[PDB]
Each structure stands twice: as C-alpha cells, then as structure tokens.
Amino acid sequence: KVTMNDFDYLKLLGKGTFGKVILVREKATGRYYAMKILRKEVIVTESRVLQNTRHPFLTALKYAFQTHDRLCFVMEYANGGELFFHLSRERVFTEERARFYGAEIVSALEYLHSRDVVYRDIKLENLMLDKDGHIKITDFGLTPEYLAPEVLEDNDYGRAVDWWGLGVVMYEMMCGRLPFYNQDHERLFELILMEEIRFPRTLSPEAKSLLAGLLKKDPKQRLGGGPSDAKEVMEHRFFLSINWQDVVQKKLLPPFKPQVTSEVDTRYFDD
Known about the structure:
The structure is a monomer. This protein is of the alpha+beta class and about 270 residues long. The chain folds into 2 domains: about 80-260, Transferase(Phosphotransferase) domain 1 (Transferase(Phosphotransferase), domain 1, Orthogonal Bundle), CATH 1.10.510; about 1-80 and about 260-270, Phosphorylase Kinase, domain 1 (2-Layer Sandwich), CATH 3.30.200.20. It is about 30% helix and about 15% strand. It has 9 helices and 7 strands; from the N terminus they run βββαββααββαααααα. β1 (about 5-15) and β2 (about 20-25) form a beta hairpin. It starts with 6 loop residues before the first strand and ends in a 22-residue tail after the last helix. Belongs to the protein kinase superfamily. AGC Ser/Thr protein kinase family. RAC subfamily. It is found in: Cytoplasm; Nucleus; Cell membrane; Early endosome.
C-alpha cells in the first residue's frame, strides 16, 4: 500500500481551504505526482468519482490513501508546463492552437458529462501540457474568477457551466486577456451577469461564433447547454476539421512540443 513514507517532498503546488497539493516523487519509481492532501476535518463528489474517471486529458488518480487526519490522492503530474505559462509567453495562441487545446478539452467534458459528472473547474490555471504537447486538465490551481452566470445567480452547477468555462478559456487563448480584463474587478458580478462580452475584430467569424455561443448567459441557450450536450459543440462551425476519434486517440499532433526529455525531466518545475 502507499504511505507518506513512499514519497519525497519536492515543492508546494497549491494551498487551499480544502487542504493542499504537493509535488512529490515516489521513491520506488522516481516518478513524479501531485499529492492532494485533504483535511478530513474540512470534509465526496471529488473522491472516487475522479478516482475512477479515466480519460486521456484528465489527470489520473494513481493512489488513494489516508492518514488518520487527512485524505491523500497521488495523481499523475504533467511535466510539459502549465498552459498559463505558455500562453503568456505568446500573449495569444493561433486559432488553430486554441482549437487543438479546446478539442482535447471538449473530449474530456463529453466524457464527464456522459457520467453525469459536472466538472466545475474548467479554467486556464487548471490546464497543463504533458511531455508530448497534450493537454491535462488538473484538479487544483497553483486571477479573477469567472463563474458562470447561473452559478452567480442561482448557485446552479449544471452541465452548462463546463461549456461556459470552455468559452472563457478559449476567449483568453485567442484574445490574450479575459473578457472584462480592464473593467475594474468588483464589477465582475454585474458584468458576467449583465454585460455583453465583446470580441476582437481580428477573430475569424467561426471562432467569434463559438465564443459567442459558449458564453451565452442563459445556460438553456449556451452552446452545449442543450440536451445534446457536447454534440452541439463538436459540430460547431469552428469545429469541422476535427476528427473526434482522433482527438480522444491522442492521434493529433500537438502544435507545440514542450521542451522536456522525458516525464522524468524536471525542468518545468520552476517559473
């Protein structure tokens, strides 16, 4: 069985109300993982559910053990760096790059929704790349929150919020900044709920169509908020060139390859 003594401490990946996430190395394999340490005190929809949700673009739960105090989840750790870091080193991504990343995300989401699982955390900080250029949706953050309108108005974490999160993520990928990046900030509540999001002119009209769709304020009208869930999104104008089987097969080539030797390469483990 796994136990605290099976790992070497590397650094803190994230702290939080729920607990913390540490970057560790399993002495037996020399392999790297992120260990989420949840206070039992503080605490279900997070345990087991993720424990089993396995998908190419979802971080995998390697081991799940518990101390008498906390709950520990050792999960695979992408070593190709964080999306935020790559994005910012380019200000924006080519629309085809957005595309490449968004589709791997759509693939994960279609999957989670097929199991009546709402992700709630689709956002740039939760995105990393693995050694090969492929996306890994993480479960934790190392930025203003852009909750979905129905979450702000009704505390309604239904399927749609994931599509809303997909839109905010690609809007930033293609524009280089959030939708209300300049407008103060304590304004976010009223802006998200009632301000129209405007799109740069430099955006292909399909891309402009996708964003306008993913960012609909009415879940009932969002691209993906319809009973067909992911399908509305997989079949959007913006998404034609795509081969979804290809997508989930990791058969697509990543438009960017992180500069790591092997998953063992610890070079992205800094800033």
